[PDB]
Amino acid sequence: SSFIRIHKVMKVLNFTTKAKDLHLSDVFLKALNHLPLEYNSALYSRIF
Amino acid sequence: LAWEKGSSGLEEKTFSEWLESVKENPAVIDFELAPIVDLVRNIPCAVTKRNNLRKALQEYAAKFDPCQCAPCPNNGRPTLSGTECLCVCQSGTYGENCGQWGCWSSWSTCDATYKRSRTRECN
Amino acid sequence: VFSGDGKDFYRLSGNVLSYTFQVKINNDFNYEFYNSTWSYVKHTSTEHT
Amino acid sequence: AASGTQNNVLRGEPFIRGAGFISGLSYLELDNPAGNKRRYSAWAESVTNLPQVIKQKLTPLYELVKEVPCASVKKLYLKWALEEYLDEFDPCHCRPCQNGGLATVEGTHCLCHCKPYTFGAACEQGVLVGNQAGGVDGGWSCWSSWSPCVQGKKTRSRECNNPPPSGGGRSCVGETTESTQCEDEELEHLR
Amino acid sequence: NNPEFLQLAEPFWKELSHLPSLYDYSAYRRLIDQYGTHYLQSGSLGGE
Amino acid sequence: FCDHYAWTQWTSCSKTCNSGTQSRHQIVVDKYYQENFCEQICSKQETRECNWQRCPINCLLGDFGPWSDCDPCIEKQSKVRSCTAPLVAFQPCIPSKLCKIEEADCKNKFRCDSGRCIARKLECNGENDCGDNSDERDCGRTKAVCTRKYNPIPSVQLMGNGFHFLAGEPRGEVLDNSFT
Ligand SMILES: *[C@@H]1O[C@H](CO)[C@@H](O)[C@H](O)[C@H]1NC(C)=O
């Protein structure tokens, strides 16, 4: 009997996100405006 | 390469093509995190809904926690996705279901001073 | 949408929340082989004179 | 006198779900058990060029009723209708199938879906190739009469039935009883 | 994402509007047969 | 010659879900058995596990809580409880107060038709910065910001998605990776 297991991982190209002044997306900013003013954990969990 | 892995025997010819394909379209492997509440900055009422989102995140972490999920057979990290708990299989393990921090305690009574504490156990 | 493991370009919408370009494929195999062979031989010889 | 009997039957049923290339892998199974590497790569490229949206998570369909005439009333009635649809032809009504078969309901007829390498009327014949542990698993019974809304709770009380765990298989997984809050005509049709 | 004003299809919206106000299991049964019981929220599209 | 005494059928699994054990063995001690030394070279039993999966506890929700007062711009009420039933189900509400505090978000910047608020400098630059061609709608003249059309970074959208630490699948898109 014989058993051989192999694995590998490559550190392919990446990028660093800027710290401040990040530009949000359309769907996110649209959903972020439908949030109520008063606190509501139920509707706030939806965007989470 | 995945298909030929049945009789790979430490194959290397397709490794170059697989590396080229990975360079063409990679997948997120390693990453650092930061609270998403810091991303909402340029809306009409930023601070109010930002504090509301912080409170919602606190209550969500109180509601859903990784400790709520049952432990895994072999050192797996259980994760909560919806109403089901899946075990993340590490290198060398397989199967459908493959220490860790326990559940937090209830918030103690607010003392005369600001100091209010919460205790977690590594059981 | 940017070209990830596909065509030149793609167009998303407001109702669609995300598009992903992470190609992950799995596989499994279960091969078997066996053989059962039987061989029984019997002989007898009796001579009387 | 010499007599010899030879009998060998080998059948394969490949499933390659690449629209046009799907038939290639199915036809190649004739005398070739191992899949061709080039054909497998072609099928992978085809599956890349055509999605397979199956194997995704689901959500209650009745939730999409948001902006329509009498929206909330229609949503509540669709909730009730989906509950009645789910419990009217649930697989609990069908009798258990032999050899761990899974029963379904198509209209007013039960169908015992047989495991691979098996066949028969109720999945009884062709037990030559099981490749499983075996036994008889447990199956949930049909839900009894619903609660009369004494305090809002439910009285489903799903218990064991005529297919008990006999061959050592695992019992029916899930809750034994259920508990909810009676709608009270859904708050008297929303306040 | 689920919570939004998702643009419904013409036949889906038409059949939802043709549903009677009063509770009638007849139309809702055909609607559930034609449209199903659940809709997809998220997940990959891996083949089989 | 071990299969001459056929193996019996696999017995029932020892337990339902926790841990399973089953065994099988019809060996008669005849002349054929004793003269072929089948006792030493042939096994007499075969054991294997069954139902090696865990015992998942059934998803158990809790009773509904008290109704929450509603003051959003949309008359909806929340009801949260702690599976196949919905986690949180919202219904129409009776609002004591309707929407309020509605005003223009942009003060010194441009207001896109979709609601996005971008700087006025990004207007009339030959690039769709709002997303719906609102800034480039009727620009009489534009200033070339880039001399030649260049290709975008491949798989750049994967680094803009959100990450849900609890779910193990990061999230849908939150940040835009096409804006420049
Ligand atoms: C006997 O077993 C060998 C093992 O590989 C196999 O190749 C051969 O076809 C078998 N012969 C039979 C079953 O007649």
What brief labels describe this structure?
part of a larger assembly; 6 chains; A: 48 residues; mainly alpha; 2 helices; 0% strand; elongated; C: 49 residues; little secondary structure; 0% helix; rod-shaped; binds 2-acetamido-2-deoxy-beta-D-glucopyranose
Gist?
Chain F: Component of the membrane attack complex (MAC), composed of complement C5b, C6, C7, C8A, C8B, C8G and multiple copies of the pore-forming subunit C9. This is part of a larger assembly, with three copies of chain A and three copies of chain C. Chain A has 48 residues and is mainly α.
What does this protein structure show overall?
Chain A starts with 25 loop residues before the first helix and ends with a helix. Chain A is an all-alpha fold and 48 residues long. The longest helix of chain A is centred in the middle third of the chain and has 8 residues, at 26-33. Chain A has two helices and no strands. By secondary structure, chain C is mostly loops. In chain C, 0% of the residues lie in helices and 0% in strands. At the D-E interface, strand 1 and helix 3 of D face helix 1, helix 2 and strand 1 of E. Strand 1 of chain D pairs antiparallel with strand 1 (38-40) of chain E, so a sheet runs across the interface. The site of 2-acetamido-2-deoxy-beta-D-glucopyranose has 2 residues of chain C, from loops. Chain B: Residues 69-98 form the EGF-like domain. Chain B: Disulfide bonds join 67-103, 69-85, 72-87, 89-98. Chain B: Belongs to the complement C6/C7/C8/C9 family. Chain B: This is Complement component C6. Chain B: Glycans are attached at residues 101, 104, 107. Chain E: It comes from Homo sapiens.
Radius of gyration of chain A over alpha carbons?
22 Å
Could you tell me the strand content of chain C as a percent range?
A: under 5%
Helix coverage percent of residues of chain C? under 10%
| Tally of strands of chain C | 0
Biggest interface between chains: D-E, 32 and 29 residues
Bound molecules: 2-acetamido-2-deoxy-beta-D-glucopyranose
Largest sheet of chain C: none
| Inertia-based shape of chain C | rod-shaped
Strand segment count of chain A: 0
Give the N-terminus to C-terminus distance of chain C in angstroms.
103 Å
Radius of gyration of chain C, Cα only, in angstroms?
35 Å
Q: Give me the strand/helix succession of chain A.
A: HH
Q: Provide a count of the helices of chain C.
A: 0
Helix/strand class of chain A: mainly alpha
Give the helix tally of chain A: 2
The fraction of residues assigned to DSSP E strands of chain A is under 5%
Shape of chain A: elongated
Largest sheet of chain A: none
Multimerization state: part of a larger assembly
Structural class of chain C: little secondary structure
Helix content of chain A: 25-40%
